[PDB]
Design a protein around this ligand. Sequence first.
Ligand code: WGS
Length: 284
Amino acid sequence: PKSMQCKVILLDGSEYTCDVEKRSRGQVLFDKVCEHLNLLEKDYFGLTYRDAENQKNWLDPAKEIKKQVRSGAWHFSFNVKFYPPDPAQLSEDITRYYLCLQLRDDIVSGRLPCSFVTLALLGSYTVQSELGDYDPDECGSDYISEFRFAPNHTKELEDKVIELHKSHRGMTPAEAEMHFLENAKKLSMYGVDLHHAKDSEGVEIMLGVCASGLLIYRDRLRINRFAWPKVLKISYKRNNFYIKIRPGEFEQFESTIGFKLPNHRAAKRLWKVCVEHHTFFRLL
Ligand SMILES: Fc1cccnc1NCC1CCOCC1
């Protein structure tokens, strides 16, 4: 029975290596990674791979790994797929811990924009969770943390992290992680997966996919939001992505909004993440 070596980048930046039979489904590898992580609340998470143009795709757990990675390396990342709108309702601290690690990367990467004060508050909770109580012996007036807190670090941000860290004396890791999540969950781009698109007039937009529904960023003054229950059908054809928006009360007919995606694969990817979010957040 022939086995393929898999390498998975974990959310702490470390690499897990294992072997699966070459005709394995994605679920087989995912179960091995989750057992390694001592993760029970697995439904929120998934594995991603990078294709030819370094674009992220979700590894479908129900399909053969080889029919997804195709010509590419068996290299994956472990990621949050479905961001819980209320992380306090997760059953396990370790689930909230992995969600914190994902969100720290969301922040440092700039996928999750954040005010100065929120960057410093989130940073202060991470430090409290990881080092425990503030100690002056490690931090002088010229302290710079090993922790990456932001897309761009400043001495002012490092100072503010330390000032807030002093306020958290006696806070346990689980407690600090829950505070981190209570703040992060409120950010306007929390759990929003952004896709580049053009509207029916060729104007550049972004489509955001999240728990609450589909967001269309038209401009800074115009953001259209379609709650999942207002969405009846999602479809793709060639480079195009379509949603069927319910008739409001007393309307005879559904409305159709069409989008142009960069290519057919980008249309299919957007369709599948929308279907998965619609299903997941219909059941929560
Ligand atoms: F409305 C727009 C049209 C075209 C490009 N960008 C747009 N908005 C910028 C934001 C939208 C989501 O948050 C981060 C980027």
